[PDB]
Every structure is written in C-alpha cells, then in structure tokens.
Symmetry: D4
Subunit: 219 residues, 8 copies
C-alpha cells in the first residue's frame, strides 16, 4: 500500500470523478464523496485498512477539461495540501470534438492537453508524496471508432507523462478493454462514458491495484 | 400526397414515437403529440397542407418492443379506427440484447420480431386505408458494430414485410447514414438512439418524403 | 443557401424567438435553442446541410419590444461577432397598446419603432455578412381587426427598412395569411400570438425559404 | 330579489364556472367556490344580503360541453336537490369547432346543443324552484368573426329555451359587448374566453342584475 | 365618481391590501393586484367604467404597521406620483398588542399611530388629487372585546384625521358591523382579520361607495 | 396513576387530537403520534414513568364531529382493543354552526351530540378498562360570546355523561379559562381553536392531572 | 421561579437546542422556537406562568461545537441583551472525535472545551442576571462505552465551571441515566443523540426543575 | 466461484438489502438494484467475471422481519425461479424489541425467528441450486450491549440452520467486528445499523469471499 497512515489523498477530474460530490469541500464518510469510483475506493480502504486513517477529498467537476483543471488548480489542489493527487481528465477534451464539432472553443487538442497536463504534474510534484495519473477512457471496443482512436492518443500521452515524471499510472482504457471482450458498451454505458456501478468498480479496482491494495491482506 | 383529405393517421412505436405524448389519447394540436418527429410531421403537414384536415394520433410508448405492440394492438390501433397506420418498432427488441444481455426474456429475437410484425401488418391491412412501415435505426456509421449490424437485419425484415404487403416504407437507417458521413454519432445522440431535434427532423423528413410531401407545392 | 460554411447565425427577438432557450448563452445542439422556430431551423439545417457547420445562437427574450432590443444590443449581438443576424420584433410593441392600453410606457409606437429598428440594422450592417428582418405577425385573418391592422403597419415598416438597407426579408404575416384561408386563429394560437408546433413550422419554413434552403438538394 | 331566504343555488358550466372550485362538492365559504364569478356572486350576496342565508354550490368543470353536462346531470344537479340552477354552457361546444376543426367528435353542433340543453331544462324545471340560463360568450366585438357569429347563434338558442320555459335569462354576450365598445379583447382575455377579474365581475354583475340584486338596498 | 380619467390610484396597507400582489411594482390587469379588495375594486371599475382608464397600483405588504409604512413611503408612494392614495393601516399596530403582548417593539400605540398617520397624510396631500383613509377593522361584534375596543379607538383617530385633512373616509368597521348583526365572525374570518371573498367584497364596496361609484350608471 | 403498567391508551378526537398523526395506525414513539397534546402526554409519561410501558395510539382525525366518530368507531376504537379510551370531540360539532351557519347538514346539534356521545361511551365502557372524557373547548374568555356559550353547553353534556358512566373527566375549558385571565385569545390561537405549543401543553397538563400524574414522583 | 417578570431568557447550543428554530431571530409564540425542548420549556412557562411575560429566544445552530459558539457569541448572545442565558454544548465537540476520527480539525478536545466554555461564561456573567449551564449528554447507559465515557468527562467540566462561576446547573446526563435504567437507547434515539419528544421532555423537565418551576403552583 | 455461468441470484432481506431498489422487479444493471451491498456485489462480479452472465434480482424491503419474508415468499422468491437465494434477515426482528419495547406484536422473538427462517430454508432448498444465509448484524463492539448480545444469538441460529441445510454462510457480524477493533460505531453508522459505503463494502466483501470470488483471478 503506497498510501500511508494519516495522509491526504485528493481526486480530481470530470463527472466520472465528481459523481455528485459535495461542493466545495468534497470530504466526509456519509455521502460527500459522491456515488462513484472515488467513494468506492474510500469504502474499500476503510473496509480493509481502517486503521490507516487516510483522508480523501473529491474535487471532481462535471464537464471539465484539462483547461478547466488548470483554472482551479491553486484553490482546489494546491491549497488543500494533499499528500497524494489522482488526476483523471481528457474525456471531455476529446468528447467535445465529436459531440459539438463546430463549437471549437470547447475542444482541447492533444498538444495543448499534453502540455497542460504536464504543467499540472510538474507544479504539483515537489509538493506531494506522489501523483497518480489515470488515463481517460471511452467504453468502445473498436480501436478504429474515431472517438476511441482519439481517446487512445490521449491515454498514450498520459502514460508518457507518468513515465517521465515518475508518477503512478492507471490505464483505465485497458481495464475496460478486458471487459469489452464480453460486453457490448451499452451494457456498461449507453453513452459510452458514464457507466453503471460495474464501470465505477472497474475504475476503483484499477486504481486500488496500482496503489498496492490487497483484497485480503498478507499483513 | 398519399395521404388525403379527412384521413386519420395513427403513429405507433417506442420512445422515438412517444416523445412525451398525452396518454392514453395521444391526439390534438397543442402538445398531446409529444415533442419529436410525430409532432414535426403534423406541423409541417399543417403548415404546407392546412386544407387536408388530417387527424393524427400518437400511440408511441417508451420502452416498447413489438411484443408490447401486439399486447395493446386491439385497444390502441384497431379500436381507434385509423385510416393510415405508421409503425416504427425494433430499437428495443434489439437494444435489450446488448444492454441487458443476460435478461433474455426482455429480448425479442428475429424469429419473434418477424412473426409478430408480420402478423400485425396482415391483420391491420384489411381494416385501414394504408400502412407505413418505418425501419428501426441505430445512430452508428460502422456497419460492423454488432448492434448496428443487428439493427440492419431487423430493418431488412421490415423492408421485406412492406414489399410483401404493399405497404409504404421508410428506411430511417439510410436517412441517418447520410448524415453520419459528416457527423459522429454523439453529435446527434449520445446514446446512439434518442436524438436531438436534428434527428427528429431527419425522421420527420424521411417520413414526409415517402408520403409524397412537397416543401413548396407544385400547383 | 446564403449561409456559408463555418458562419455564426444569431437570432434575436421576443418570446416567439426565445421559446425557453438557455440564458445567457443560447447555444448548443441538445436543448439550449429552445423549443420553437429557431430550434427547428437548426434541426433542418443539420438534417439537410450537416457539413456546413453553422453555429446558431438564440438571443430571444420573452416580453421584449424593440426598445428592449436596443438596450441589450451591444452585449447580446455586437459582442457575439455573428456573421448573420435575424431580427423578429414588434409583436409586444403593438400588443401592449391593446392588452394594457392605459400603461402607456409599455407601448412602442410606430415612429419610435421604425427609427429604433433602423438604428439596430445600421449599427450592425458593417459588422456582418448579412441581416434577416422578419416581420412581426398577428394570427388573425381580418385585416381590419384593430391589432391586425396595426401589426400590418409595423410589418410594412420592416419591409421598407429591409429594402433600404439591402437586408433579407421574411414576411411572416403573409405566411400566416395563407394558412388562415383555411384555419380559424384558435387552431394555431388561442391568443393569436403564441402558436403550436405548426405555427413555429410556418415561421421556420418562411425563414429557410428566404435563405435559399432546399428541402432536397440539387447539390 | 328572485332568490329568497334559505334557498340552495347551484351553478353548473365549464371553466368559466369551475375557476378551480373544490371537487366533488363545490360548496363552502372559504375557497371551495373557486376564484371567479360564482365566488364573486356569493361574496356580494353575503356582503349585501347576509341575512338571506343562501347556500351556493359550484359544479363547474373545465372543458365541459353540454354533452358532458348531460352525462353528470343526475349526480351533480338532480341529486344535490337545488332550489335554483344556473347554467352557462356552450363556449366549448363552439370553441372545439374552431380550435380542433378536424376532431369532429369533440364538436357539439347546434342540433345536439339545442336538444340536449332543452332536455336538461325541461327535466329540471319541475324539480326546483327556478332556473337561470346564462348565454355562453366570446370576447370579440366583431359580429362577423366566425366564432363570435356561431356563439351568438348558440346564445339565441339559450334565450329562446329560457323564454319557452319561463326561466331567468342572462345575456352575457351583451354585457361584454358594452365593454368591448372601449376595450380590445386582449385587455380582458388574451384567448377571448378566460378573462381577468374584470371579466368575472362583468359576469357576476350580469347575473346579479337579472336576479334583482340591489347594490344599496332600497329599504 | 371622484376619480378621473387617466389618473393613478395607489393602495397601501397591510396583508388585507397586499393579498399576494406582485412585488415590487404591484400593477397590471392579469393578477399583479392580488386576490382581494384591491383587485375587486379594479374589476368593478373596469366592468362599469372601462373608459376611465384608471391606473391602479397595489403597495400592500403583509405584516406592516404604520411604522412600516413610514419607512417605505418615499419609494412606495411618493416616487410613484399617484393622483389618489388610499391607506388602510392599524390592524397589526393593534393585533401585536394582543397576540405578542410581551414583544413590545412590535406594538404601535395610539399616540404614535395618530402622529405617524397624520405625517403621511400631510406629506402626501400637496402632491395628490386626493387621499382616501380607510379605517382598520376587527371582525368582532362585541364592542367590549378588548381588541375590538382598541381597534375602534384607532378607527376614531382615522376619522378625526380624515376630517381635519379633508381626506375621503371609509369606515370599514361600520361596514362589517352591519354584517355582524347576522353572521358570527368565524363565518367571515376564523382569525377575525383575514376574511373570505365576502369580506373583501364588503371592503371593496365600502371603498367604491365613498368614491361615488354607481353600480348602474345614471350616465 | 390511574393508568397502569402494560395498558394501551387510545386517544380519539378531531384536529386537536390528530395534529398530523400517522394514518391509519397512529402508533409509535418517533412521530406517529403527531405534534400536539397526545405526543406531549406520551413524552411526559415516558420521561417520568418510563417503566410503565404504556402503549399509546392516536386516532384523531382533523375535521371530525361526533357523527364522524360513530362512523369509524368499530374499526378505530373497538378493533384496536384498547384499555383506556380518551375522547375529545365537540369543537367541530359547534364550530360548523357558526362558520357555515347555512350548511345545516354539517352541524351536529345538542340532541345528536348527546345521544351519539352517550351511545359511544355506553357501548365502549364494558369493553375496556377505563374512559376519559375531555370537554371540547373554545379559546375565548367571554362566556357570552355565542360560540363560547354553546361550547360550554356541549361541555356540560360531556361532564354529565362522564358522571353517569363513572368515566374520568377533563375540563379543558376550565384549563384555558385560567390562562385567559392573563392572555387575550390571539396569543394562544388566532382562530380560537388551534393553539400554540403552550395550548397543547395546557391540554396535556389537564389530562395528566386528571390521571394522577406527578411531575416529581413522591416515592 | 428564578426567572422574573419581563425578563429575556436566551438558549444557545447545537441541534438539540436548534430543533428547526427560525433564523436568525429565533423568537415568537407560533413556531419560531423550533420543535424541541426550548419550545416545550416556553409552552410550560406560558401554561403555568402566563403572567410572567418572559421573552424567550432560541439561538441553537445544528452542528456547533463550543468553538462555533465563541465565533458567534457577540452577535447571537451579547447583542441580544438577555437577562438569562442557557448553554448546552459539547455533544459535537465529542461526537466528531468518534464519527470522523481522522478529520481532526472538527474535534474540540477537553482542555480547549473547558477554557472556551469558561471564557463564554466569564464574558457573559457581568451582563446578565444569571447563567444556566446544561451538560451535554449521550443516550447510552454503559459508562465505559468510549463516547459515553468521554461525554461524562465533558459534563464534569461543565459542573466544575458552574460551581466556580455560581451558575445554575442542569445535569442532563443524570436525567437520561434514570430513564436508561428501563429503556435501551434506541427507544429514545437511534443515534444516541437526537431523541424523541420524550427525550426533549426529559431535557425540558430537567431545565425547569433547576429554575424552580412548579407543575402546580403553591402560589 | 460457487456461482456459475448463466445462474439467477436473488437477494432478500430488509433495508440493508433494499437500499432503494426498484419495486416490484428489483432487476437490472442501471439502478434497479439499489445503492448498497447488492449493487456492489453485482458490480464487482461484472468487473471481474463479466463472462459469467449472472442475473441478479434484489427483493429487499425496508422494515421487514422474517415474518414479513414468509408473507411474500411465494411471489418474491419461489415465483422468480432463482438458482441461488441469499437471505439476510433479523435486524428488525431484534431492533423492534429495543426501540419499540412495548409494541410486542412488532417483535419477532427467537422461537418465531428460528421456526420461520428454518421453514423458509427447508422449503426453498429443493427448488434452487443453492442458498446463502447471511447473519444479521449490529454495529456495536461490546458483546454485552443488550442488543448486540441478542443479535449474536439470532446470528447463531442462522449459522446452525446453514450447517444443517448445507447452505453457504456469511458471518456479517464477524466482518464488522474486525473493523470495530479500530473504529467506533458512529464512524460507520450513527444508528448502528444503516452504514456508509464502507459498511456496504464490508458486507459485499464478506459475501464475495464466501462465494469464492477472487479480486485478481488466478488463471
Ligand atoms: Cl459526508
Ligand atoms: Cl464530465
Ligand atoms: Cl393538445
Ligand atoms: Cl424506447
Ligand atoms: Cl444544449
Ligand atoms: Cl413575448
Ligand atoms: Cl370552503
Ligand atoms: Cl372550459
Ligand atoms: Cl398582471
Ligand atoms: Cl398583515
Ligand atoms: Cl413513529
Ligand atoms: Cl378539526
Ligand atoms: Cl413564531
Ligand atoms: Cl448538532
Ligand atoms: Cl436498472
Ligand atoms: Cl430495515
């Protein structure tokens, strides 16, 4: 378990991270974390590692791109003095290109995305114990569907950044891809983005595996 | 125009037809028709052929398969004594196979679909002046996406029942396919099924074209 | 088609233009345009000309007169940098004279209306590709009903302005008048102002015809 | 005053009568009567003739035609054992001909109107102390507007049934016509049917005048 | 009729005047006047004197005493430039003494009430055509019930002020007292203050009589 | 204490008893009892005699007269098998005579009141361990107010049925009369019937005193 | 009775004091006091000592610790110029330690609690007639349950402060403890903090006993 | 994994099972399962064993005891034809003894509990592929708290019915007891029964462990 006793873990991202969390503070055991993967992660950490006393904060905001993250980074991340920061962003940066193809100011293209994401990591890194970069995803098994193919470009950039900055790394697309050998997307998400509890459990599990959670502790 | 003065035109189908129509009656100029293609059809007929005096009833019900249509056919179609019946059914018959793959009782497989749709068309045809069979559709441009491929098969059944029964036929998939040469599905429908006003306009236009509507009357 | 690829078309007016559009921005494919003629225009443009990529903004506000338009023109029109501006105003300028005949400050009489409308057109014209002036209307077929007779005076002023300024011109009253050879007003609008889908389709069609939309493209 | 001490006065009709009255009972001093002319009548009677002890019941139902009155007459009129019955019906009988011209089953044409109203009056008359027939009306000053012209015909039927049955008679059209020499319809009722408090006062005053109310008692 | 053509009549007071009027403006034919005596007055004036074109504004605020009136007098009265001002205040000034007898700051005793009311009249008088002073009231027929006896003291002060300032005068208590020879208070108002439509009609009639309204005009 | 360990105490009456109790059951510690004197009684019993283990059911129904109690007596009283029944009824029996003086069917005059209450008490008495008859009341200190005077008569009937049947008796009027030497009615109840928490405490205290509650147990 | 005629008694605390009181003022006979012990105290004082005319203000705020009280003390206590101040605080100071054991900034430990509480008392004492210190409580009968054991430490500090400052003292825990010889906590409060009416009556009674209330006055 | 491909797993119990599941059906991927352990189980199965194709139905109903389960067993369990039935019941059977100690009909004492649960298990076992008996629980670490001690006894009954019937068994108390070595109950559940997401994760994990789930499959 990478995360130590008494440390503060902060999640940031878009609607997938937000999932109705309390604004602004995003912190608490009784519903403030929202109803998705972040809450599940916290639940599993308290169920299996209750004695760690890890404080968890949810700073997800629905609709955000990486441009949006940068605009609130000082208040929502730096000022919280976290020990660990998890980032999942990119879905909207890409989705806008495809759902509102002529509203170009809503789009964040790959080279802006890469430099902005890198800027967040590099600002943050000297201030925390660690960073977890989670790729964006698209719940679509055809690698050549245009949005899937784009998403994969963004996920490859995240991986490159994590390698270069010695951050932890969660490939969410790879997690979905395993399940998509069996299920058509619509069984997880009608819209291919916002999933069922199952999808959120896919995400929470992928995150926990990368931080060295054990389902039943050797300890 | 195939449809003539004083005739009662009754539309039946699933959510795409329903669009929040008034239940049970589904009839009237002031919101009873719902907010999608059926209303748009009636509006355009009224704007361009006000003198036709067509009465239009919306018997769409969200969620329905053709098995559900059969269960209400007597009270919602035959008892309304329509002159013209327009049917668009099949989306849910297919979609349940993909979004609830393990709840097999909710699926209506091709054998049940064909037999049932066929039976409804045959029973109805001698009772009315005319039938219009509209294909189901899936807003997805890849013919080898599994659900698109299934939907195309269901739509071949509809085409061949229309041909056999000398019913009018509207190929709604082909109408979307044209726009899909330009737009990614998400620009019309996040979930590839329930579209924007533009999608309902694609549907209304396809219907009207098949019934010989003229945008500006030749006269 | 007068409107070119990539251009921004902005509609302004009263409740007939507003129809519940999102405030303040009024822009988007999924409901921000409201539920009336503006949305229908956009729907038909995307259904038939998806590749044009025309951005459309709805700046209608319920209750407005031309005095009101002038008060928000800089923020709601100039600052949007549109390529095309469509204006429909006058209904309230006139209606107040008849529904609140003793609340005179709510009235905008014809000579103020004419000069104010002209001022908007002349301010705007050097900044855009084109202007579309749509007359106000009253859904009443008796030319000598007092409100109808007044409305027609205002529509004649709009026509004169469009001719003088080389704007495009939509005679909405003439569009209604054709339909009113068959229908009593109440079949379109109980209040003779706010119509059914059919009325909105009358308007959308009238607008599209003036910009050279084709229902089925020669192209 | 035609109406005397301890008598039960029952009003029946459509929305103009209903005005949100309590269902099913329609009786009582504290809001059960609704918010229009029936309540205003009861208030004025109470203010000026408190000692009369008149009981008043509102059996108005929004949307009704005379065909609807007949269907509920037994339970809503005869079973209430009133002394005096006031009827105002006909607006919807007419209005449906004009606002839903093609839904002919919703229309109640003059033959059905006369026969039915006549039958109700004849059946009721021997069971009660008195009947008051109030004309329907249309807030429109042009006698040749098609709906006004129809409404005037229906009102001639009412007048002649009242004369034949020696019922009291209230010419509500004539009461509006007087105000319409000054006001355009929209100042009283946007839709020419459901008026402001002023319109309900015109109705209440016309009723009271016919029953011999005095604003200040001669005594 | 004291009130002339084109003049502005403004009502001010407490909840009895307010009756849910629109804030802040309190002016309009379609519900802004609230649902009580003020609206009824306007209704009767439009029904019988439509050609007068009298503008009416409702500045009632629930809970107010005369202290409260003075605090908003410049914005709610002076700044409206009325021709006629009607005042009804005192009910709360008195009621608080009896319902919250130990919350003394809510009480306005008679000598403060008299001087404050006089100050409003004297400030206003040089700016208007006329003032109408309506007494407060308490719907209680025992002159020796403590609250009734107090209320009567306040009404006598209003009468004295009206005489001294040559204002018009409405004795609302005397109007109620006539009806209370027949009805127990609870038939008009459970709380002895907020009445039925009948009570509001008592008030509206009392006001109209003092301004020389005729129910049927000699004119 | 008259009431003993393990006994079921059932309260019945009108709004004063109901106070928003859960329907149909009316039983339980956590809000089912409503928010007035019945709940206050149960709370005080629990605070001071927790060991008594009294079960308490609230069968109050807003609006009821004794005629309504009779109509539900079998299912709401006898079928509950109580040990002790507390009745407080009469307010509405009286109040309808005064607030709806002309709706005579809603009145329950003294002959019906006495006969009915008497019959209920006689039928119930052999089936239970004990009955407590609480007078109705009117929060009004003037014995010659007409409704107070009637209520006092109804309360004499209750007292004399209690004496005859050796039932416990609570004179609720006398409990209010004591406070009314100090407070005007409006300080307890604007409408002289439905009081503040203080009024419900006056009722609860009167009940408890009659059943031999001690505020601090003598032990 | 310690509290004299005309004096102002102010309660402050957490949710147990707040119980939905009106913000900000917290004062009035008709619901502003909330629905718990404070209201009950006022009810009993008005039922038994109506002539005292004691004004009572509720300044409870849900969630508060003693740190929170100190932050609003000047506006919510000093500025009200009370004669008597009752304080009940500590429940949250303790509860947070146990429900959110890793959100340490929400905790108020005993030595901070003691000094802060003392500071409030000492600031206040020269400005009032008297202070009533009510212990916090936990509805749990096992003295060695960790939260109960902590709560008792805080209650002992309150007692010490009251002794040192010559304040009045209410041991709420001792009151509960008597009832907990019979009832399991859940019969009073599922959460062991927020009780039924019974629990609130326990509190109100404990408070009244300490101020020398008599249930039936010797006087 | 004990549970195999294509099998229908039906969960039944009280609120802890229900968690807002869809009624009556309780089945489906998109929210029908509710928001607690049942949904979490289904999500984890889907994330880790998507190919198993397990159908899962939630028949939990808030408030139920085993007496309630028996009353609906035919329609909610047997008629669903499940392969696997998971039962968790007993919380309410116990809790009513403690929170409503005097409403003895609501209690289900150990004799009724054992007999009834036993009978259900015996009747069901020959009709299905397997049964999983989950203990009730109480989030309380003191074995001598009276309700914890009772709950432990009920849980011994469940264990011994499971052993006798060769049913799978989940000791949910033991799973909470482990976390309770660290956390006070209030950190998981204020009321010691309805827990946070962490509590539902403790339950889901205990279930999954008993059915041989692997967090990462050995393969
Ligand atoms: Cl929380
Ligand atoms: Cl999002
Ligand atoms: Cl409609
Ligand atoms: Cl559907
Ligand atoms: Cl949108
Ligand atoms: Cl408008
Ligand atoms: Cl009523
Ligand atoms: Cl109607
Ligand atoms: Cl208005
Ligand atoms: Cl008021
Ligand atoms: Cl309860
Ligand atoms: Cl009642
Ligand atoms: Cl209050
Ligand atoms: Cl709190
Ligand atoms: Cl679902
Ligand atoms: Cl439950």
């Amino acid at each position: 378990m990478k995360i130590g006793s008494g440390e503060k873990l902060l999640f940031i991202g878009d609607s997938i991270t937000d999932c109705g969390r309390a604004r602004p503070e995003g912190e608490g055991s009784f519903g403030a974390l929202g109803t998705g993967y972040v809450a599940y992660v916290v639940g599993l950490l308290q169920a299996v590692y209750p004695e760690l006393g890890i404080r968890v904060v949810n700073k997800g905001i629905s609709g955000n791109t990486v441009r949006d993250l940068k605009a609130r980074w000082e208040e929502d991340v730096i000022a919280q003095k976290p020990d660990w920061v998890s980032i999942m962003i990119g879905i909207n940066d890409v989705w806008r290109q495809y759902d509102l193809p002529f509203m170009k100011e809503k789009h964040v293209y790959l080279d802006e995305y890469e430099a902005t994401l890198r800027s967040l990591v590099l600002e943050t890194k000297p201030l925390v114990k660690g960073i977890i970069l989670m790729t964006p995803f698209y719940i679509e098994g055809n690698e050549q569907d245009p949005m899937r193919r784009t998403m994969d470009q963004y996920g490859r950039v995240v991986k490159q950044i994590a390698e270069e900055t010695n951050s932890l790394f969660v490939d969410t697309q790879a997690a979905f891809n395993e399940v998509l050998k069996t299920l058509y997307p619509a069984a997880l998400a009608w819209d291919r983005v916002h999933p069922s509890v199952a999808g959120h459990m896919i995400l929470a599990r992928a995150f926990l595996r990368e931080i060295g959670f054990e389902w039943v502790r050797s300890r």
